[PDB]
């Protein structure tokens, strides 16, 4: 218990990435590089599992692993790490998703050195975001992921990727513009200039100042998390990409903006959270409605699944402002289920893109007459994505609906209107995913699609990744009490504080 674990887990890919430019002579395509990176990711996930199964307890509602390191006697940059209740499954999802994305990146030929170096650099930042417990080092870790994913989407993507990459880096800079201001504003109020996280939650502010701080938080969190006025970056970001970077794009990177959206805007200030809770609920409803109606008319194969990320994060945007213990506990499960569904679905889309070069739903008419494992895996992943109860998406939306049904201060009109609108939202959301599977596979055999390109049936390696990605969703949806006890005390303390602050 006296040994630093999370610091070495963060620093180990950053140290191990220096051996990627070394590389004694393979005389080939770069197979020792991926064979070293897969072993590094495997032992990092093993260290994460060994650190989770021993020292993390389920009794103390605070932070089990508390390690503080004085970096400088200056401003207040302090390496203080801490694992919470609703952040502990996030690191185990991060390591698992990044390990399977490293394992899924076999056909890399054009510059694999910089690819695996940026992969090992992003894997350090994806743990350094969730493991930090500061205000300035959190902004540093938020701006740490600015360059590598933008560089990967620049050096490879679909067509006209240069217009999308500059828009993505300028959108991320506009997101990071407000974080330093909103972090210094709450820190410069009164006294205790040091940037400890436990002291910033005990401070008292005025009403209009808290409204301005919550507005500066919500602007950046609406730029990051896609809502209907600020989601124009996401088709250009998540449509023009390849599979192993799209796994990390559609997995933990979207939940990073939702974890801080809970942790800051509920624990730091809940007084201004209740005044923007109907606005956030209505924005999530309009997000859920607009994503399906936009993705149904789209003809691109990848944007049709990229808008499902908006359609699934609208449920989190609804369940955040429910003011209920079950509604707060279901949001983390919905985020984990959406990440595990979207990473598998986008890896499958990037896998079937190599077998059929045209990304049009009209010419794809007879791709199911030769390969059957691909069609079976697509049907299984789609049925896991729509509404199925064996997977945990139905359990998560049921938790959201039950937590929103028994609420307060929204008695007669608001609950029934939001429930009736989310019901037609879940009417609308399987339509495009059904129409895509009806148009691509179900049909006659196209002669020109076989004459132009030749498709080969899938490997047993491609079965293994989907078999590893599908079983935790079924394990959570069959028994939802495994994820409940991890953050039950933390969500109970959060809802108790939010109901103590909220009057009447």
């Amino acid at each position: 218990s006296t040994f630093p674990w999370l610091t070495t887990i963060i620093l180990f890919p950053i140290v191990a990435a220096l051996a990627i430019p070394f590389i004694p002579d393979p005389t080939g395509k770069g197979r020792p590089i991926r064979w070293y990176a897969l072993a590094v990711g495997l032992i990092d996930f093993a260290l994460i599992v060994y650190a989770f199964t021993n020292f993390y307890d389920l009794n103390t509602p605070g932070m089990q692993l508390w390690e503080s390191y004085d970096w400088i006697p200056e401003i207040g940059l302090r390496w203080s790490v801490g694992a919470d209740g609703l952040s502990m499954p996030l690191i185990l999802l991060t390591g698992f998703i990044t390990t399977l994305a490293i394992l899924a990146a076999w056909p890399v030929t054009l510059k694999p050195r910089l690819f695996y170096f940026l992969m090992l650099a992003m894997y350090g930042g994806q743990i350094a975001v969730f493991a930090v417990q500061d205000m300035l080092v959190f902004f540093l870790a938020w701006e740490l992921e600015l360059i590598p994913v933008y560089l990967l989407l620049a050096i490879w993507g679909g067509h006209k990727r240069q217009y999308a990459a500059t828009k993505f880096i300028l959108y991320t800079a506009g997101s990071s513009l407000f974080i330093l201001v909103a972090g210094l504003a709450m820190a410069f109020y009164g006294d205790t200039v040091s940037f400890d996280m436990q002291t910033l939650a005990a401070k008292d502010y005025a009403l209009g100042f808290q409204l301005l701080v919550y507005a500066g938080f919500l602007v950046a969190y609406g730029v990051k998390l896609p809502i209907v006025p600020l989601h124009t970056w996401l088709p250009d970001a998540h449509g023009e990409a390849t599979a192993p970077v799209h796994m990390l794009l559609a997995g933990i990177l979207l939940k990073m903006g939702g974890y801080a959206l809970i942790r800051m805007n509920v624990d730091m200030l809940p007084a201004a959270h209740a005044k923007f809770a109907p606005v956030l609920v209505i924005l999530g409803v309009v997000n859920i409605i607009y994503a399906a109606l936009t993705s149904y008319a789209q003809r691109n194969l990848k944007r049709k699944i990229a808008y499902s990320s908006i359609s699934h994060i609208g449920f989190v945007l609804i369940g955040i402002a429910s003011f209920t213990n079950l509604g707060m506990s279901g949001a983390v499960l919905q985020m984990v289920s959406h990440g595990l569904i979207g990473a598998s679905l986008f890896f499958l889309v990037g896998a079937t893109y190599d077998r059929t070069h045209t990304l049009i739903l009209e010419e794809m008419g007879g791709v199911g007459q030769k390969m059957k494992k691909i069609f079976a895996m697509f049907t299984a992943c789609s049925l896991a994505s729509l509404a199925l109860p064996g997977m945990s998406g139905f359990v998560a939306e049921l938790m959201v609906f039950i937590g929103f049904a028994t609420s307060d201060a929204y008695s007669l009109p608001f609950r029934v209107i939001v429930v009736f609108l989310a019901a037609v939202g879940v009417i609308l959301t399987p339509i495009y995913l059904l129409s895509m599977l009806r148009e691509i596979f179900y049909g006659p055999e196209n002669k020109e699609l076989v004459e132009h390109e030749a498709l080969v049936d899938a490997e047993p390696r491609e079965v293994f990744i989907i078999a590893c990605l599908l079983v935790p969703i079924i394990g959570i949806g069959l028994y939802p009490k495994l994820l409940t006890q991890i953050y039950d005390a933390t969500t109970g303390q959060v809802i108790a504080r939010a109901r103590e602050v909220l009057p009447t």
Partner: protein, 53 residues
């Protein structure tokens, strides 16, 4: 069509007015030498004009 035109054109319009603002502000450097000293003397006079009033 609304999502492709209306909410998408605002960012492109801000980028376009930023680009033409940069163009119209780099058009000022003509290359005349004594016009630069005239601008310098105008700034020197305008500093006292703004600081007195």
């Amino acid at each position: 069509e609304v999502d492709y035109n209306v909410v998408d054109g605002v960012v492109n319009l801000t980028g376009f007015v930023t680009m033409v603002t940069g163009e119209g502000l780099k058009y000022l450097q003509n290359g005349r030498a004594q016009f630069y000293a005239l601008i310098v003397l105008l700034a020197v006079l305008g500093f006292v004009i703004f600081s007195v009033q």
